[PDB]
mmCIF file of C-alpha atoms and ligand atoms in Angstrom:
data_model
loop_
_atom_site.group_PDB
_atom_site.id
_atom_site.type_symbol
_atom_site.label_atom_id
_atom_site.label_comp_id
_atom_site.label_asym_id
_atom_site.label_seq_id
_atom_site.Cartn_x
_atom_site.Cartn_y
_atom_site.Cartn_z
ATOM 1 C CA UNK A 1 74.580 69.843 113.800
ATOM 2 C CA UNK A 2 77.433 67.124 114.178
ATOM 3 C CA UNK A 3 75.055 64.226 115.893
ATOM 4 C CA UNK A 4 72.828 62.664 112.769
ATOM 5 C CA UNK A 5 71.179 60.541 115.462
ATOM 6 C CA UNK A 6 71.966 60.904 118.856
ATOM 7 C CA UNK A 7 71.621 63.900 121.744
ATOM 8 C CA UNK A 8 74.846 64.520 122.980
ATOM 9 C CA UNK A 9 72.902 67.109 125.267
ATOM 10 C CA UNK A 10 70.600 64.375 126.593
ATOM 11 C CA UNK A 11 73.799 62.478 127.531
ATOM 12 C CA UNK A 12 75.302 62.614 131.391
ATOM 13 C CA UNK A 13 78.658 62.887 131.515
ATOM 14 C CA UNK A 14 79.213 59.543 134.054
ATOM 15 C CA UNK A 15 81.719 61.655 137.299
ATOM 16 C CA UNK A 16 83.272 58.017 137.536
ATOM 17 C CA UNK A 17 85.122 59.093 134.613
ATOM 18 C CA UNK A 18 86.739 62.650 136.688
ATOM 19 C CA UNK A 19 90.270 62.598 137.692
ATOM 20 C CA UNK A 20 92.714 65.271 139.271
ATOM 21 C CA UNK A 21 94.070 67.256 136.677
ATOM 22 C CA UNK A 22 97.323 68.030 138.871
ATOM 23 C CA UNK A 23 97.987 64.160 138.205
ATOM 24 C CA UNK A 24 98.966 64.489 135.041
ATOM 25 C CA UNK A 25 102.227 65.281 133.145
ATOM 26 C CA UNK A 26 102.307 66.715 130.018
ATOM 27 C CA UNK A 27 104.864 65.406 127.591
ATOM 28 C CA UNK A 28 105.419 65.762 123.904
ATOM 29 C CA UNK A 29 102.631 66.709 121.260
ATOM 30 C CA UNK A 30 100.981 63.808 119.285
ATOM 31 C CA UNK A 31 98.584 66.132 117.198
ATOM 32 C CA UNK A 32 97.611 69.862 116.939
ATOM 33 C CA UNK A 33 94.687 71.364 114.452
ATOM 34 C CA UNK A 34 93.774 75.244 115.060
ATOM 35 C CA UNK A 35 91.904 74.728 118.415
ATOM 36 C CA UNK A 36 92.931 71.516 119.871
ATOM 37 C CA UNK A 37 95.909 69.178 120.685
ATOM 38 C CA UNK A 38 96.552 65.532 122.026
ATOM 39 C CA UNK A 39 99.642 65.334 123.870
ATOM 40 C CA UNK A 40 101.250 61.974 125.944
ATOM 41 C CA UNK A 41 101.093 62.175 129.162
ATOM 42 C CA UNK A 42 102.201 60.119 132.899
ATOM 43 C CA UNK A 43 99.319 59.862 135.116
ATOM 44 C CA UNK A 44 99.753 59.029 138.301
ATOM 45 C CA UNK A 45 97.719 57.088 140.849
ATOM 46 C CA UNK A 46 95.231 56.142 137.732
ATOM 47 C CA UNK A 47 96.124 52.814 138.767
ATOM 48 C CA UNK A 48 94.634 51.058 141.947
ATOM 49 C CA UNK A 49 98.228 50.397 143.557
ATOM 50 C CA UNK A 50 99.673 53.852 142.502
ATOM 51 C CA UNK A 51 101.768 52.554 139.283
ATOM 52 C CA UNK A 52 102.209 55.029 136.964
ATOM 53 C CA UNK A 53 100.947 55.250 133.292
ATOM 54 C CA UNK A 54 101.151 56.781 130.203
ATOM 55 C CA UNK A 55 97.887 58.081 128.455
ATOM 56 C CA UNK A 56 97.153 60.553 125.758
ATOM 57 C CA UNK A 57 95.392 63.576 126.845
ATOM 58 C CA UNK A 58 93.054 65.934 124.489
ATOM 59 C CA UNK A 59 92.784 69.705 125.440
ATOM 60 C CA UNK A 60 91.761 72.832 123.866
ATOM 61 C CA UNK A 61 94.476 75.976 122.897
ATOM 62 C CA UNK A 62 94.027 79.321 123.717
ATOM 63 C CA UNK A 63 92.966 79.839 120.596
ATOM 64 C CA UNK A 64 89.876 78.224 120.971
ATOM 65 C CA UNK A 65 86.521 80.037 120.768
ATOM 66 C CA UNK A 66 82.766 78.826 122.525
ATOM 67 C CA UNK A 67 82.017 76.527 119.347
ATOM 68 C CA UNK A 68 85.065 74.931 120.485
ATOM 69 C CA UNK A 69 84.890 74.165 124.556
ATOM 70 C CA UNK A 70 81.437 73.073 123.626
ATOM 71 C CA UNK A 71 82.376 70.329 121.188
ATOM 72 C CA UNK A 72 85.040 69.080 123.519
ATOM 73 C CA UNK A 73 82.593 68.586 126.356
ATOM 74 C CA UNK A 74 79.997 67.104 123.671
ATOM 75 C CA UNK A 75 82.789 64.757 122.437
ATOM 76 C CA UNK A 76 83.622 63.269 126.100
ATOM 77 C CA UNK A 77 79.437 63.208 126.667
ATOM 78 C CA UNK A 78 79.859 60.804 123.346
ATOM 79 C CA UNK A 79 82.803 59.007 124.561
ATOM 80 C CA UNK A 80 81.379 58.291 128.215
ATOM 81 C CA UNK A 81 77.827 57.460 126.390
ATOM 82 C CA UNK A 82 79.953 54.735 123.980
ATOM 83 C CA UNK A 83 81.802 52.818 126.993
ATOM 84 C CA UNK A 84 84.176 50.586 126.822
ATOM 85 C CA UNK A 85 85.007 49.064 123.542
ATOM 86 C CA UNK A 86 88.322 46.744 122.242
ATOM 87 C CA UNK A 87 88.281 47.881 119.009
ATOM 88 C CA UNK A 88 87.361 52.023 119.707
ATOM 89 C CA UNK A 89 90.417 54.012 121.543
ATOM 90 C CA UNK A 90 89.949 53.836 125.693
ATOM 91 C CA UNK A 91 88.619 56.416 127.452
ATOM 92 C CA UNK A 92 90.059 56.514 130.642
ATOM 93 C CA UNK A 93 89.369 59.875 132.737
ATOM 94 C CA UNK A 94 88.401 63.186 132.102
ATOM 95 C CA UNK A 95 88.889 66.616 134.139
ATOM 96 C CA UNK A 96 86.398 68.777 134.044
ATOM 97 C CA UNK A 97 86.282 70.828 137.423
ATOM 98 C CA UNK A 98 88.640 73.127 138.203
ATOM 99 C CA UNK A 99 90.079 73.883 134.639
ATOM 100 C CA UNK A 100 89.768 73.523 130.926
ATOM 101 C CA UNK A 101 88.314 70.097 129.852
ATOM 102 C CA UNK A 102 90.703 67.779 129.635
ATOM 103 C CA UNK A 103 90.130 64.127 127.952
ATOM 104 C CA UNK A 104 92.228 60.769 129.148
ATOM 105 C CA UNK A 105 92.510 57.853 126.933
ATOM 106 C CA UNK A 106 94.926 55.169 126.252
ATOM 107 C CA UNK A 107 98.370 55.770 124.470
ATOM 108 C CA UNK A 108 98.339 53.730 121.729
ATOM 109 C CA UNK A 109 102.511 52.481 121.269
ATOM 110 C CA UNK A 110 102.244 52.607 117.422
ATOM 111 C CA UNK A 111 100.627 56.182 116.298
ATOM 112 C CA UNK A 112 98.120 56.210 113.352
ATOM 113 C CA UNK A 113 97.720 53.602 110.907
ATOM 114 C CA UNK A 114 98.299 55.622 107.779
ATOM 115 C CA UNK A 115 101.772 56.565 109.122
ATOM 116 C CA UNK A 116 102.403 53.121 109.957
ATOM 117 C CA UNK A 117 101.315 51.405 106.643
ATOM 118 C CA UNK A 118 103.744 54.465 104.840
ATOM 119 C CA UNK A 119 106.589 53.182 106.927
ATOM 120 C CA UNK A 120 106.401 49.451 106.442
ATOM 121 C CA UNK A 121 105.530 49.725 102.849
ATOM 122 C CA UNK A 122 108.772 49.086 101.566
ATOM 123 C CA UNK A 123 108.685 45.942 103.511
ATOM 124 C CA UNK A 124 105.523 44.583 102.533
ATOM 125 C CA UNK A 125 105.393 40.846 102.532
ATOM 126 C CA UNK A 126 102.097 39.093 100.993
ATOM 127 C CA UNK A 127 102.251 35.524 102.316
ATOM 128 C CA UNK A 128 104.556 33.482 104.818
ATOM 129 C CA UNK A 129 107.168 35.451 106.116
ATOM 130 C CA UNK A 130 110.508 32.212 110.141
ATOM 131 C CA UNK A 131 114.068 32.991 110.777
ATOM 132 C CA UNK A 132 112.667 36.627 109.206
ATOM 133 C CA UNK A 133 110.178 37.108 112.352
ATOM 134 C CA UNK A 134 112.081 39.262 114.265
ATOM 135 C CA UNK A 135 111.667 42.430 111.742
ATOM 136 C CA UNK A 136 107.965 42.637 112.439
ATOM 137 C CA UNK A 137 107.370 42.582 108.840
ATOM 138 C CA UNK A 138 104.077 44.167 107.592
ATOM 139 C CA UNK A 139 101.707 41.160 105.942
ATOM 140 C CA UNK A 140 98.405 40.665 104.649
ATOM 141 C CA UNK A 141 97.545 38.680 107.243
ATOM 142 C CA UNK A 142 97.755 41.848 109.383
ATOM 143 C CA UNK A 143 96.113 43.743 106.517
ATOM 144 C CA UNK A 144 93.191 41.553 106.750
ATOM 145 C CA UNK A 145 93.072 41.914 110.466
ATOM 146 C CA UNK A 146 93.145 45.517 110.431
ATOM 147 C CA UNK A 147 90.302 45.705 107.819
ATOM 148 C CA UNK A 148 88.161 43.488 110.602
ATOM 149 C CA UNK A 149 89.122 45.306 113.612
ATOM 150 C CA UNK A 150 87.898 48.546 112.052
ATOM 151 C CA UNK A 151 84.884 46.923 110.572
ATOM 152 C CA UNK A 152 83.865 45.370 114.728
ATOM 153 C CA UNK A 153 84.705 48.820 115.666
ATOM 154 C CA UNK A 154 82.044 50.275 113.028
ATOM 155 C CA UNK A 155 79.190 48.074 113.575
ATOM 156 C CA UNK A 156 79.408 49.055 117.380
ATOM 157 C CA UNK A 157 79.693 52.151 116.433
ATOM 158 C CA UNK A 158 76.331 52.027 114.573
ATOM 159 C CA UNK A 159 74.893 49.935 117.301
ATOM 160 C CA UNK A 160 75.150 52.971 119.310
ATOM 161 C CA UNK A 161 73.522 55.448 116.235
ATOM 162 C CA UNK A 162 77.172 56.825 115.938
ATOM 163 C CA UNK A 163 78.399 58.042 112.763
ATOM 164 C CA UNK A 164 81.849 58.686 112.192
ATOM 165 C CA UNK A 165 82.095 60.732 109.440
ATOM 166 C CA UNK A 166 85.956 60.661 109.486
ATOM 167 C CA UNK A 167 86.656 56.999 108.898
ATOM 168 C CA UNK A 168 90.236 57.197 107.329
ATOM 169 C CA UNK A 169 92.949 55.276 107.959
ATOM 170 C CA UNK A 170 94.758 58.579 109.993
ATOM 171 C CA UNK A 171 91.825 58.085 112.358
ATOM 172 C CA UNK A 172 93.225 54.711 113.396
ATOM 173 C CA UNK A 173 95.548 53.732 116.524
ATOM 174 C CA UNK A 174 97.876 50.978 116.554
ATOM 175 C CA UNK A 175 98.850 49.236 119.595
ATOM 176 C CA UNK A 176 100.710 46.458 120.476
ATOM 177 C CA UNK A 177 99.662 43.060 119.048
ATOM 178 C CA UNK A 178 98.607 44.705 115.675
ATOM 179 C CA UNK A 179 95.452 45.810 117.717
ATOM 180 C CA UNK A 180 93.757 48.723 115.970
ATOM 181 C CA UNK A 181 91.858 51.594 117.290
ATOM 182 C CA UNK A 182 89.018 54.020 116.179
ATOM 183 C CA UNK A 183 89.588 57.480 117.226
ATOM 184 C CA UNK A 184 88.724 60.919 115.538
ATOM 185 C CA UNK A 185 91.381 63.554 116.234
ATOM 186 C CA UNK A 186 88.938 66.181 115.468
ATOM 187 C CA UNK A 187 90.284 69.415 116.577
ATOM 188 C CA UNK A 188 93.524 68.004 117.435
ATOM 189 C CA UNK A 189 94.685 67.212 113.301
ATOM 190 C CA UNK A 190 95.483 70.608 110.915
ATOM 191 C CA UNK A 191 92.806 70.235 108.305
ATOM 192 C CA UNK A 192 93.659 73.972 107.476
ATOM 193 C CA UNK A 193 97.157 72.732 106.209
ATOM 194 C CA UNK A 194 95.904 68.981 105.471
ATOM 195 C CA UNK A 195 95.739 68.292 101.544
ATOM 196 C CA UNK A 196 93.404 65.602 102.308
ATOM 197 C CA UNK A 197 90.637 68.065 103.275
ATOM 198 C CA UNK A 198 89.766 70.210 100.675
ATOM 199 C CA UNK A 199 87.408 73.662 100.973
ATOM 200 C CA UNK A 200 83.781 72.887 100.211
ATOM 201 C CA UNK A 201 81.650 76.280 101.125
ATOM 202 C CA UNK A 202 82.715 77.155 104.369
ATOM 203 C CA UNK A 203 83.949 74.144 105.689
ATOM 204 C CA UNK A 204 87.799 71.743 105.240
ATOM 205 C CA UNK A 205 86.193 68.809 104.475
ATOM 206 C CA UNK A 206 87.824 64.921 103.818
ATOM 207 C CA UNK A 207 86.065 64.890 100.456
ATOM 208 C CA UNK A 208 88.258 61.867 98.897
ATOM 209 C CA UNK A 209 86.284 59.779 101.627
ATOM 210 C CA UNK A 210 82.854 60.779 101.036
ATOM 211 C CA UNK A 211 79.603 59.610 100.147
ATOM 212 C CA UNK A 212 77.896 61.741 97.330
ATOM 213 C CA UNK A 213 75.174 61.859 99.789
ATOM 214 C CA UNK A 214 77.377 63.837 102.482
ATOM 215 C CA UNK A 215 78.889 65.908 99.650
ATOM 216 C CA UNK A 216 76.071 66.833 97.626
ATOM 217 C CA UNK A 217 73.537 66.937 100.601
ATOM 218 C CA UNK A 218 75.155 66.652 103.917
ATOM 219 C CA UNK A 219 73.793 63.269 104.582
ATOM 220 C CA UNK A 220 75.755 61.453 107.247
ATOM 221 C CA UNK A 221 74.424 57.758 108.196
ATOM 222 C CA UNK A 222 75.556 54.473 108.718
ATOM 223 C CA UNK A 223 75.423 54.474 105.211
ATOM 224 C CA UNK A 224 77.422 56.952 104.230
ATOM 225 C CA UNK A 225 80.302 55.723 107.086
ATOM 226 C CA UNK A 226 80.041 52.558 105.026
ATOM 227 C CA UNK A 227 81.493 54.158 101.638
ATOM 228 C CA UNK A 228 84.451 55.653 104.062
ATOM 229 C CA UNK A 229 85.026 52.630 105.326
ATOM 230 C CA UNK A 230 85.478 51.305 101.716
ATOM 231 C CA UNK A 231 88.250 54.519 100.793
ATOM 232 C CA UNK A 232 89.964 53.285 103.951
ATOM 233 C CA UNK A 233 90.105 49.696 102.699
ATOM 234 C CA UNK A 234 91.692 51.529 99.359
ATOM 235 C CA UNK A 235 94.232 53.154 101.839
ATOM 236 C CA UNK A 236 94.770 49.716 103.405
ATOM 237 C CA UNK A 237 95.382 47.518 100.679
ATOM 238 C CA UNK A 238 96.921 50.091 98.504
ATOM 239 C CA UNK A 239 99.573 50.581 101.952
ATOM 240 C CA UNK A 240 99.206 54.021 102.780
ATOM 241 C CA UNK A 241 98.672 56.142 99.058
ATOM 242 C CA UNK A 242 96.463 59.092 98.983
ATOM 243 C CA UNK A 243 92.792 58.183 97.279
ATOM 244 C CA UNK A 244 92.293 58.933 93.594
ATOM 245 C CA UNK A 245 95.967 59.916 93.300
ATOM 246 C CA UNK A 246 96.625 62.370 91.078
ATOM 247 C CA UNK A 247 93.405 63.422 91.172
ATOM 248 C CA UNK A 248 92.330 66.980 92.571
ATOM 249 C CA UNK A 249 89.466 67.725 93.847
ATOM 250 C CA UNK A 250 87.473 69.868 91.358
ATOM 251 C CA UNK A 251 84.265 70.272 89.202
ATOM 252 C CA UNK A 252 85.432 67.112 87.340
ATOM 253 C CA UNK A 253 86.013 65.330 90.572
ATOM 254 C CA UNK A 254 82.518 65.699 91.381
ATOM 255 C CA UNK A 255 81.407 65.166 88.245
ATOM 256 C CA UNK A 256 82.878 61.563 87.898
ATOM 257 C CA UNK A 257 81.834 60.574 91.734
ATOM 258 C CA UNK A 258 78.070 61.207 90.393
ATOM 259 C CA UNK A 259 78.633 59.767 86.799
ATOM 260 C CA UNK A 260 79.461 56.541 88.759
ATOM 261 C CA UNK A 261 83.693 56.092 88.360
ATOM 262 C CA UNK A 262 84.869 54.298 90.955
ATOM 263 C CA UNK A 263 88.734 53.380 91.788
ATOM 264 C CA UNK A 264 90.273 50.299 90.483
ATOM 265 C CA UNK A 265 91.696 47.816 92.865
ATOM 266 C CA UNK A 266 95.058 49.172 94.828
ATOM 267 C CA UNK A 267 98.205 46.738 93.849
ATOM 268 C CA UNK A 268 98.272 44.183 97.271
ATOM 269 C CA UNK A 269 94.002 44.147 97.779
ATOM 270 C CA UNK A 270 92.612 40.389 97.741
ATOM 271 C CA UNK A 271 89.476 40.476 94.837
ATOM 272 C CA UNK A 272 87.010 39.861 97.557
ATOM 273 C CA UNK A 273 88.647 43.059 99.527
ATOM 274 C CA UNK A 274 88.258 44.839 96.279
ATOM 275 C CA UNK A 275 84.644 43.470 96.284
ATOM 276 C CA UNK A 276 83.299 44.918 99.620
ATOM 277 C CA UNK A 277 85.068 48.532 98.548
ATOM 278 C CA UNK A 278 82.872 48.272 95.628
ATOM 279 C CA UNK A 279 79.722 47.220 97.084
ATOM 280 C CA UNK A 280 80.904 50.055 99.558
ATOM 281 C CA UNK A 281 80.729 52.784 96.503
ATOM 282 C CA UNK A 282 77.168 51.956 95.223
ATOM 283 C CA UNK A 283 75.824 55.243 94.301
ATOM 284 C CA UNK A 284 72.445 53.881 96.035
ATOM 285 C CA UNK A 285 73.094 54.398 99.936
ATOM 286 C CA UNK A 286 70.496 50.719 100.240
ATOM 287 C CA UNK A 287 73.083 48.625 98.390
ATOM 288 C CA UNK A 288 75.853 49.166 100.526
ATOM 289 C CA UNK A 289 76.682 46.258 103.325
ATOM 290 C CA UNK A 290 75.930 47.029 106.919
ATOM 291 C CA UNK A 291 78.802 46.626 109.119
ATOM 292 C CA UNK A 292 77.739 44.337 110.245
ATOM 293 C CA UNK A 293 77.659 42.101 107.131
ATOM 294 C CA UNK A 294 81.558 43.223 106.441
ATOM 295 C CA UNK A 295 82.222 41.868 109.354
ATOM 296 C CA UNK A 296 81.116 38.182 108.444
ATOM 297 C CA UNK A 297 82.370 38.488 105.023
ATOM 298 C CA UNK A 298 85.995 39.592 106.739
ATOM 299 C CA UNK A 299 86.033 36.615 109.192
ATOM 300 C CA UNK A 300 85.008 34.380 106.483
ATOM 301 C CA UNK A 301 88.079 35.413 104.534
ATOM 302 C CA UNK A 302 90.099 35.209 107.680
ATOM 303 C CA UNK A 303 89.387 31.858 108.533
ATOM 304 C CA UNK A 304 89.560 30.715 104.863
ATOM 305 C CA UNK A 305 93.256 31.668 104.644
ATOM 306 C CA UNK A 306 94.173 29.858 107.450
HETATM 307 C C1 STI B 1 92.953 61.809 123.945
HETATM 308 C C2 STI B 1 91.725 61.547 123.101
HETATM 309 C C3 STI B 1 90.571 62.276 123.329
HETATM 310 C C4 STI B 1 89.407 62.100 122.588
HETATM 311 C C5 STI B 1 89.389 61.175 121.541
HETATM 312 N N1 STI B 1 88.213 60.927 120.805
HETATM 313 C C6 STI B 1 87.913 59.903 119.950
HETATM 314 O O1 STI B 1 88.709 59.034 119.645
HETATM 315 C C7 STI B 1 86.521 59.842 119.396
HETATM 316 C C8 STI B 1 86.133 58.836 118.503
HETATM 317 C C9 STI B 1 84.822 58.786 118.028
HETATM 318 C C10 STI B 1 83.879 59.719 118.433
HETATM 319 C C11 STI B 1 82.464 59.679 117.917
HETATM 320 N N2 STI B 1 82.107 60.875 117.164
HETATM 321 C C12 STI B 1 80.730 60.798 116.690
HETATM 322 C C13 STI B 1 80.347 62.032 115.890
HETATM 323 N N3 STI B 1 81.266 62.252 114.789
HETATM 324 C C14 STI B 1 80.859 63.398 113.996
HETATM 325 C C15 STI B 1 82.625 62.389 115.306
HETATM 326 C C16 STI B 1 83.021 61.131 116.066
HETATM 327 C C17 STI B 1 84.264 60.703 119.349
HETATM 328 C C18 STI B 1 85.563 60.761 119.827
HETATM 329 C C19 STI B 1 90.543 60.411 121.296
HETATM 330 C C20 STI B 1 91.701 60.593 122.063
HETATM 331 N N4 STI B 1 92.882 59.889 121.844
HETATM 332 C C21 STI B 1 93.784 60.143 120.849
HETATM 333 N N5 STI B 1 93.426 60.996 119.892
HETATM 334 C C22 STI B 1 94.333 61.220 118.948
HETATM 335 C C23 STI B 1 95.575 60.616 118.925
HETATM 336 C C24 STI B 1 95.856 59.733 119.972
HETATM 337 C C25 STI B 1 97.142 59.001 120.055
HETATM 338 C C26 STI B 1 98.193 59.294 119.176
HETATM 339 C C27 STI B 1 99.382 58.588 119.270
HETATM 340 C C28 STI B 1 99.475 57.608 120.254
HETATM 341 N N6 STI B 1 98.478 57.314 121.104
HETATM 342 C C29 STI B 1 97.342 57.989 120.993
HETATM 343 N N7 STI B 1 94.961 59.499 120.917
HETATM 344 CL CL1 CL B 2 87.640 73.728 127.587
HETATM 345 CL CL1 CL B 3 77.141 60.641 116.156
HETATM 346 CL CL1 CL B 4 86.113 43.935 89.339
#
């Protein structure tokens, strides 16, 4: 099962969440895996006074088999059970009668945040960028930012006995005002075709940003969310490179993660960035910060810089 912790089949799906399907306008394709897609959308009337608005919208292909319509309902049960959160992408509506499901949230103006740290890497500007404003220049002030959205985002995700088990930085939104997002495209992203999820048994699985625990044993905690959330700071502060590059994933691969080597720090990561990722890699799940804890050390950095 999917759900260490919670029941998504103890959760009501909340009907102030169900809007008319035939108000929505399907647009252009943001993601696509095997079974699913998100694609942007118009909706009208979602708005009080009848502006309209654009959203993203989730939705299965025909493709899709029980396994499938039954994780999509699960996953809006989840999303409706979370509620609103700044830091975790918006739900907004959801059809469910009278069709497929269908899943509303908000479109989030700058994609994912591994895309977005690829194309401003080039760019890259550690401190003090003036007359240069205008070219929205990538910093580490924004770097630091991001790192303590997504940390806020996973401490209310544990809050709620949520794990993740996707944290990555192509699981984050960007929207305007360097705002960040936590989604999980799921079913909507091609991990068949994806070289960042590699075959383990019978499953496509983001190996590069797992615990031992969840590799060796399936163990998925808030734990084990916590070393992802370290290979994502990696990502971050290395500005968009793949994890242990060069590096397959093979019997050796394994064999080092358990032997205890660890990555050095990227090129642009502060030393006490590079110290949460390793605190984030202990091999002992009970050494790893909470959340929680990351997010104190974060603000602490923040508000040291400044
Ligand atoms: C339209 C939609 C429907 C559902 C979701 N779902 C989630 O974001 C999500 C996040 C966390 C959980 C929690 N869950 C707990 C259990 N573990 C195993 C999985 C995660 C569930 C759903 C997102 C979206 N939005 C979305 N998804 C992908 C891409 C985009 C997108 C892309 C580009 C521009 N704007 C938006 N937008
Ligand atoms: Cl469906
Ligand atoms: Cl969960
Ligand atoms: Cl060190």
């Amino acid at each position: 099962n999917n759900y260490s912790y919670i029941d998504p089949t103890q959760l009501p799906y909340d009907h102030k969440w169900e809007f008319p399907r035939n108000r929505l306008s399907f647009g252009k394709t943001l993601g696509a895996g095997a079974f699913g897609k998100v694609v942007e959308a118009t909706a009208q009337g979602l708005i009080k006074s009848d502006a309209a608005m654009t959203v993203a919208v989730k939705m299965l292909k025909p493709s899709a088999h029980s396994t499938e319509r039954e994780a999509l309902m699960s996953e809006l049960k989840v999303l409706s059970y979370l509620g609103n959160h700044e830091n975790i992408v918006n739900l907004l509506g959801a059809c469910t009668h009278g069709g497929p499901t269908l899943v509303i949230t908000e479109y989030c103006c700058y994609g994912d945040l591994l895309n977005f740290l690829r194309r401003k890497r080039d760019e890259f500007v550690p401190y003090k960028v003036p007359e240069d404003l205008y070219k929205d220049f990538l910093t580490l002030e924004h770097l630091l930012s991001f790192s303590y959205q997504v940390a806020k985002g996973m401490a209310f995700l544990a809050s709620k006995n949520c794990i993740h088990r996707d944290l990555a930085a192509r699981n984050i939104l960007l929207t305007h005002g360097n705002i960040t997002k936590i989604c999980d495209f799921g079913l909507a992203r091609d991990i068949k075709n994806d070289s960042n999820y590699v075959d383990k048994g019978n499953a496509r699985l983001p190996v590069k940003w797992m615990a031992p625990e969840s590799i060796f044993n399936s163990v998925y905690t808030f734990e084990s969310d916590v070393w992802s959330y370290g290979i994502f700071l990696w990502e971050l502060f290395s500005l968009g490179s793949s994890p242990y590059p060069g590096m397959p994933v093979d019997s050796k691969f394994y064999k080092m993660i358990k032997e205890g080597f660890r990555m050095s720090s990227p090129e642009y990561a502060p030393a006490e960035m590079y110290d949460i990722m390793k605190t984030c890699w202990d091999a002992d799940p009970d050494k790893r910060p909470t959340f929680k804890q990351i997010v104190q050390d974060i603000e602490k950095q923040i508000s040291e810089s400044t």
